[PDB]
Amino acid sequence: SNIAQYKVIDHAYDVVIIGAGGAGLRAAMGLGEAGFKTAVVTKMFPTRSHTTAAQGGINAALGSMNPDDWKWHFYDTVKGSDWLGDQNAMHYLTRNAVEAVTELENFGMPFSRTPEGKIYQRSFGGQSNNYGKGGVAKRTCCVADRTGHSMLHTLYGNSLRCHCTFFIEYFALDLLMDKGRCVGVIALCLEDGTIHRFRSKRTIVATGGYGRAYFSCTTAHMNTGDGTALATRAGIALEDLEFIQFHPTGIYGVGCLITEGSRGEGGFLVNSEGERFMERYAPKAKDLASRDVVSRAETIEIMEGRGVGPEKDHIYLQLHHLPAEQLHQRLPGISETAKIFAGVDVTKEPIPVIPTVHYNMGGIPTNYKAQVIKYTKEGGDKIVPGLYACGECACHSVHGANRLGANSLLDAVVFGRACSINIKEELKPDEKIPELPEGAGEESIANLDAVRYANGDVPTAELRLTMQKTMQKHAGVFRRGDILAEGVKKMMDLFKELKRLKTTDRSLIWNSDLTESLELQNLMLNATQTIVAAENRKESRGAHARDDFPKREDEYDYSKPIEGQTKRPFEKHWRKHTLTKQDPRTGHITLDYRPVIDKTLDPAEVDWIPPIIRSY
Amino acid sequence: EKTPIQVWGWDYLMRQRALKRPIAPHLTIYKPQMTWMVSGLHRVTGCAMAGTLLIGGVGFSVLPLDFTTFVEFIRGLGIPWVILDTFKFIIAFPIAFHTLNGIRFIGFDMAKGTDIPSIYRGAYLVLGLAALISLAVVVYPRWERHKKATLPT
Amino acid sequence: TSAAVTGAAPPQFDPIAAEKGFKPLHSHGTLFKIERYFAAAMVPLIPAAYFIHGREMDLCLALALTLHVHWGVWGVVNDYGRPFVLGDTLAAAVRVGAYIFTACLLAGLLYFNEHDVGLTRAFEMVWEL
Amino acid sequence: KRIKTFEIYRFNPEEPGAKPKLQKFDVDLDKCGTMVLDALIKIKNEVDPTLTFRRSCREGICGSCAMNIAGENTLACICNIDQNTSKTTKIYPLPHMFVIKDLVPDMNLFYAQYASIQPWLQKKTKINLGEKQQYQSIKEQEKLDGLYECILCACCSASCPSYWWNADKYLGPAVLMQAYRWIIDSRDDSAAERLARMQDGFSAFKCHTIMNCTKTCPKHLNPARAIGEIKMLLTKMKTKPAPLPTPANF
Ligand SMILES: Cc1cc2nc3c(=O)[nH]c(=O)nc-3n(C[C@H](O)[C@H](O)[C@H](O)COP(=O)(O)OP(=O)(O)OC[C@H]3O[C@@H](n4cnc5c(N)ncnc54)[C@H](O)[C@@H]3O)c2cc1C
Ligand code: HEM
Ligand SMILES: Cc1ccccc1C(=O)Nc1cccc(OC(C)C)c1
Ligand code: SF4
Ligand code: F3S
Ligand code: FES
């Protein structure tokens, strides 16, 4: 850190939360409730966190509309994870879904109500009553079109009562580590350019995902997957990074989300020939089939020319057939959102949409206790002390290969709640606040000091763009071994351009040029790991679909009957998590693979669902 | 006697001064709109009249002048058939506009007429009746005295 | 290096802890009510002054006007007579002045009714030009 | 070469004894997106990266990008660039706020005031958390429509001249409407004590019905109005029809 001097500021808390998104805030409320001196660290105001932009709804088996068993939720979630989903985590999610969302009503979330006065639910993507046998399920509870805005503002409000101390606009640089143990976090106070070291017995990572690793995305600009990168720079393997979900109905132009609620209310996808083409691709579910299918099904129509508009390159979402007193009631957000960015009167015209990057199931590997883990091939799942994770940045996993619709706001909440529940217990008040080793994150700063005065000939702005495109091309909805190899070749050579970086802005106080550069740093780690994982995965499963490996590789062939066959070895078949372990400095990436936890938590409360062929 | 938040609000203002932090512009930069321009002209006139009543009530008291000398003094120049009623219109309008607008500005204390159509309508409505009543009050006796120069009896 | 100083938690408003002690119930609300009532009552009055002139009207005008302008100037004195931009006691000077303005106003108007044309007659005479 | 020219407010606290500035930035509208924010980014990305400013969402739902654009307080991301290349779009920060750097202002007071209204659900009978849905009717919950949407951009408090003057004491439109939002929520019980906290002559009443809040607001909402009901509520010219009856089969 030679070229400057820095104001270093220590602290001491019980538990630090890097994140003020749904998960981080819920996590905080429970810890305040428990009585911990809880520091919430966020690189922007909590209400600006991504959650806010969420639209469709949040999932729970409430049966405000009709009878519902959470076990039917649990099913559609395991089939949604294309059996790459650790079911012990999914069991936790779907069991407590009804308690957690009810909590939110009890925190003053203004859920839309049915005439009965109950929480109005709608239908959504990839759900169904009676274990896939029955109808299309109505579990997706909502505040009409704007569920995530109202969930966050509510969760935040209630966290002003938890006596939790807020560090707002603080960019977290690294997880402060002591040989296996997370003793705290380091950050940069944007307000005064001071550096802050937070000592803590625990550390919850709720940073969200890396939607900006791709060119087009519904995500917000601050989806740079920092927490995911922090873990890597502390020496942890990330999980299932190649599984990037593509949301079907992202607007043609900017890529802003048009909800799946727009489809769950009775809207549908129409090609250049005026065919509701999803009725072919999904005989049963139609336009409420899972997102990886619907987004693929779009791309097929485009790539075969029946795409619409002046480039025959996107398609339509249709709402000019639903009654306008429902559009206005159930979809006012997208109504205006479409009317602004597309100029579309949704009651008169369709909305030009296209598959778009949205959610990263992939993240920091954890158990069901939302605790970060490492995975030796012999020792197994060895946890990381003083470290927890939840939200989009985590991979429990409750989404394996494909996240279900309306499940993340729940994943954010339930496992945020879980973080505190699980910490309240396993933390004990005799355990003193850990001291920092001398010269902690002297590198963390050095790194910053480098980027701050960046001297090379590549503008930080341009190196991002070329990453984003190099990505957009190679790791699309349909990917192939030759493309991916050729992607990895470019991405790894873009990584070497990091030493050739340029930044003009030199100031400490509110340097959006410097901070964005650290985001790019973090994004490049995620991205590199995303594509090397994808290149290597020789199968089609969930979001990640390989033209050259278009069957779901499983222990058994599951189309044929089970008995009579003979289970493959762990090496050949791909029912396993992808654990990329990048060398933060050089960029070398090594892999290893970890089993899917098939068992539930209580075999007495529910049965583990056998892998059947995922059809909608 | 401050509420706990308004205490904090002060301590803040201090802390904000401390940092020599500049303040964003406002009147300097903000655009003219019929919401607050009207607010200005309600309060501009409101005051002007009260300052008149002081400059009038206390001014004529302290000074030796009675009002009857003043009314005669101006007829000294005996300014044009126009320029008088101009000043009459200038004197009616602050009372006219204000008093009308007072019924409107009470409205928005009751949530009555607070949407942008109701705001912008009322703005023209009040200016209309203030233009009418001040012109009508001023050009009525003037059109009764020039109804002597030629009259029946 | 990490030869740091230990810092403190950032300044923040605790609405639960500020709830200790706070009993202020000096319900200004009922005063607002009467300001507006009165002003609505003056809606017929201005017409009445146009039509029914006289010394006793002057008195209703000079009583009401001094009472409504008193409430008015106090408003404008609080908006612009700010402690921040004036310093505490100097703001209290304007503050007190808002009451001086009222008492000087009424006396100014009372002198004029009782030793001059009066409000009503003053308009007749200037409209007569 | 449809070169739009921009006059952006500039300022550097780093630079010793420096003062507010105005910089002119030119932008090729053919090489740019349709929204103001796109240019500001384009500018940071291609021209001067020191141009510091707040963004997060692109869809106008976060509240981060509040600022002044051609004399009005609005969100950049969903405000359209003025296509007339002979003219300039004049970009300043949110009026009468202390500026940190360029278009970034300190919020904390605004944030702190919205914290003082106890923006969360309060009920006298201690109910259990994840146990039961509380009752609220379609008519009841629909009241909040117009209130719950506020993203806390502060375009409205930044436009209110009464806020400019007495910002420390007068809560300002956006914060008030959230105070109101929690008042009329049927499920909410401690609604009198909420009024109790802004009974004084500044907190609430210093609203001189100017109406910029409602006119400037990028989400088309109406604070002036909810202030209305507060004035009626505080004067006891009105009060809320208390909770509807939660039926015994619900
Ligand atoms: C357009 C859209 C619509 C959606 N709709 C739905 C829906 O209807 N239902 C549903 O279930 N899910 C939905 N999702 C998914 C869901 O909203 C998110 O995945 C979820 O809200 C993530 O919450 P989180 O707490 O993990 O992190 P986020 O809400 O993403 O916030 C991340 C937090 O981490 C902090 N952070 C990041 N980096 C740093 C750093 N370096 N230092 C310090 N702090 C940092 C940020 O300040 C931020 O507060 C939607 C997503 C999008 C994009
Ligand atoms: C006759 C009917 C009148 C009505 C209904 C009326 C109503 C009102 C109202 C409601 C206000 C408060 C508005 C606010 O707070 O912004 C006000 C303020 C004021 N009025 Fe009047 N008024 C009337 C006549 C007058 C007259 C004749 C004067 C003459 C001097 C006057 C001077 C003022 C002043 C100085 C204020 C100051 C506060 C301000 O502008 O904000 N008013 N009036
Ligand atoms: C503060 C106040 C209360 C009630 C009625 C009017 C005002 C008032 O003068 N606003 C105001 C004050 C100064 C300037 C301004 O316009 C600027 C945009 C030029 C408006
Ligand atoms: S009200 Fe309209 S303007 Fe005032 S904050 Fe909420 S949204 Fe921004
Ligand atoms: S702009 Fe200003 S004073 Fe009252 S109603 Fe709107 S706040
Ligand atoms: S950046 Fe989200 S409000 Fe425009």
Numbering used by the authors:
A (entry chain A): 30 to 645
B (entry chain C): 34 to 186
C (entry chain D): 28 to 156
D (entry chain B): 33 to 282
From the paper:
The enzymes of the fumarate respiration are anchored in the inner mitochondrial membrane where complex I (NADH-rhodoquinone reductase) acts as a proton pump that is driven by the oxidation of NADH to NAD+ and coupled to the reduction of rhodoquinone (RQ) to rhodoquinol (RQH2), while complex II, serving as a RQH2-fumarate reductase (QFR), transfers electrons from RQH2 to fumarate. Since fumarate respiration is the major pathway of energy metabolism during adaptation to a hypoxic environment for many species of parasites including adult A. suum and bacteria inhabiting anaerobic environments as well as some human cancer cells exposed to low nutrition and low oxygen conditions, the pathway is one of the most promising targets of chemotherapy for both parasitic diseases and cancer. In spite of the similarity in amino acid sequences and three-dimensional structures between A. suum QFR and porcine SQR, flutolanil specifically inhibits the enzymatic action of A. suum QFR.
The importance of this electrostatic interaction for the potency and specificity of flutolanil as an inhibitor toward A. suum QFR is proved by structure-activity relationship studies with flutolanil derivatives, especially 1 and 2. In fact they poorly overlap with each other and are separated by more than 3.7 Å. This observed difference in the orientation of the interacting groups between the inhibitor and both enzymes explains the importance of the electron-withdrawing property of R1 substituents on the effectiveness of flutolanil as an A. suum QFR inhibitor.
